Paper text:
VapBC TA systems are the most common Type II TA system in bacteria, and consist of a VapB antitoxin and VapC PIN domain-containing toxin. The related vapBC locus on the chromosomally integrated Escherichia coli F plasmid is mutated in bacteria that are tolerant to beta-lactam antibiotics, before subsequently evolving resistance.
To investigate the structural consequences of the vapB tolerance mutations, we used X-ray crystallography to determine structures of several VapB variants in complex with VapC. Moreover, the structures of VapBT3NC (2.6 Å), VapBT3N+A13P+L16RC (2.8 Å), and VapBV5EC (3.2 Å) revealed complexes that are virtually identical to the wild-type complex. This demonstrates that the overall architecture and integrity of the VapBC hetero-octamer are unaffected by the tolerance mutations. Plasmid loss assays demonstrate that reduced plasmid loss conferred by VapBT3N, VapBT3N+L7P, VapBV5E, VapBL7P, and VapBQ12L is Lon-dependent, similar to VapBL12 and VapBA12.
Numbering used by the authors:
A (entry chain D), D (entry chain D): -1 to 68
B (entry chain B), C (entry chain B): 0, 1G, 2 to 68
E (entry chain C), F (entry chain A), G (entry chain C), H (entry chain A): 1 to 132
The structure:
Amino acid sequence: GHMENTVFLSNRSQAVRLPKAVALPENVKRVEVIAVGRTRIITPAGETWDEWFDGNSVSADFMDNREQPG
Amino acid sequence: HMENTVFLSNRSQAVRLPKAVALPENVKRVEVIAVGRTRIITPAGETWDEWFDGNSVSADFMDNREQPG
Amino acid sequence: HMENTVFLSNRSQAVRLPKAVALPENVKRVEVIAVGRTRIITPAGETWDEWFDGNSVSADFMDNREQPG
Amino acid sequence: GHMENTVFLSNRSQAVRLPKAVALPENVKRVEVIAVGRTRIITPAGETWDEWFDGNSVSADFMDNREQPG
Amino acid sequence: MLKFMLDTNICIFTIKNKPASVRERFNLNQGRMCISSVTLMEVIYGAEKSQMPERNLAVIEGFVSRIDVLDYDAAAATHTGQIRAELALQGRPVGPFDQMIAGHARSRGLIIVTNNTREFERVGGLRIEDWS
Amino acid sequence: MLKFMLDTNICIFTIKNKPASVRERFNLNQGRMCISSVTLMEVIYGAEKSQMPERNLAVIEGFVSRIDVLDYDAAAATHTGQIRAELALQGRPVGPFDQMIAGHARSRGLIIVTNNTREFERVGGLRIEDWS
Amino acid sequence: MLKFMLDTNICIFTIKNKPASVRERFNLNQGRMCISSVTLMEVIYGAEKSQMPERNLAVIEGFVSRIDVLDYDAAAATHTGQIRAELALQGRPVGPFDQMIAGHARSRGLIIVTNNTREFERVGGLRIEDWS
Amino acid sequence: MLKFMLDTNICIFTIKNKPASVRERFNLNQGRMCISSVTLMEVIYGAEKSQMPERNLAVIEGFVSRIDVLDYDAAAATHTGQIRAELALQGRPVGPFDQMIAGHARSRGLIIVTNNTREFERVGGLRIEDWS
């Protein structure tokens, strides 16, 4: 996970290039930033299980007729 | 709390960092560490502060290393 | 039978090929295939001749594919 | 295993660059060439088991006192 | 590091029923969990054959994007072949997708999580867990 | 540069029988041919269930080393989920492996190369070729 | 493709006794065989502690250079940790090097070849074979 | 750029207790530190045998993600084979893991960083440092 870098400033803020050795899933397009000390922690936005469990559900016809041949 | 957007920059992923959670001006170099889908952004030379101050192991952890000898 | 030496060329491994086992002059391009520690050197476009003419599978081999259906 | 190339001639013979995708063990420094049709097959020199089994043996003090702690 | 490969059976079970007992294992092992792309194929099929595909697809997407999805690659394929033969020569029956999931996990040393333990217990050299 | 995906049926057909008409086709289309991991799963199985596995495995290795093996990825799994439902609407049967091979081809825009087109004709939007 | 990981026990057994029954398995599975670098450490020690190290080293080198030697990497290390704990919590004893070899093989799905089957049978999700 | 290899003892010591004097040392020597796969095997074990593994595994991940993990390669295995014999000549004991950690360091010319030098002093030709 180790990899060093330099912070460059954007048009509105500071930004950080994530070198390949460290880069996030390209699947991730939104991120939450948490400030802890002089350190910043970024996390993929909305990925705890509790949101999904309490959130939207499938229709009751998405069923267990799994249709694995036999 | 403070959500954000992911940039693509220098053929790599990048991160807008809004003012409310900005790094101090004392910092120009950053060590970035990968754990799961999370990345830790520490000032170079303050790399370990987040881990020392952060969570810790349970009290039972490795009470002996159990190397034969 | 005919042993040989391994060269290091073009930052890569290479192979002296003595006269006794030389490729025909009809050949300038070569397909090279890797199987275990062995490499097969075929004229491009004659890539499969060594495999078709070479060893074969036992007669019991895949008498049915046993895909459910 | 697929990878195409061009045969170049050395000071004494024809030679073939082995691109990285195909390259032999760097451990291998001698090779046997077998001619089959218009195809050449190269093999690491002296690596069948029968040579080793029939060949040199260890001194009778290289023993089963394996000394795995316990 | 990844550690667990989720069976298609348990995935269906949780997407449907969202039981708190799996929610707890999910919260504990978040980041240590994956599915075979074989399983991804199955749920996309259930969603595309539902009446409300875009809805169920979206719930499918929500579940999968908290997952690491592994491609069914050559290692996985080869281990599946050995499994299909190891089972055949012992006469033990296991479904085709389940065979490909078992092989995928064995190929990478992952623990399979399933509630169809009986079928997956028939596979050799494979650690099995039931989170339901 | 890739263009053709050899399904399992052509692979057996070639491996078991080595037809001369196939050799020319392969020699001539070298570099544009590939198989799915799913097809690999099956030939490895045939070797491993056979009465001389180490021999048949070696024959496999030489075949597969000449072509590319493509991982059955999320894209293949998506397209297969669509196809499996497409077949539910058309009401025509297809074997499991074969529908994954189809989805894989459609996902990468490759021509199915087979010896038994009659199965692959039922699924939509694929270039199919018979090399038998 | 690799398939088998040779225990240190069987390696010692064959280097010493060169039995024809292993010679046959060696000739059949040549190219499908490897050892953990853990094992490489052990035999180099036996050679360096012998009276004729350069001789036994050379016989060691002859055996190893027909082998693929795998580095004991992070995957192997992690699986060993799980094994040491899986065994401890069941009270089953297995030697330290043997634990690292088992984990190395399990980490890559390899079949362990050993004549100390009793110890290695105590490890979970690991296929075991005896070639002696 | 690498210079120091943290043995297992310093790793536990740090992970279990997080001493302030170690934090400065680590902060200051970031980028020049690494561990052996062998040490990784052991901390993973400690997590996995503990009564809260998923928690302790997460603490491990953050530690290890900050440093390099070096594979125990043929070079480490060679040097360990020499050391194990070197200790037989000197007649002084050393634990298994520890002698592999030593060999690994000597093989790569790295300074052992420890809290208990008394074990590592017995083996020849190593720079040793106490960071406790």
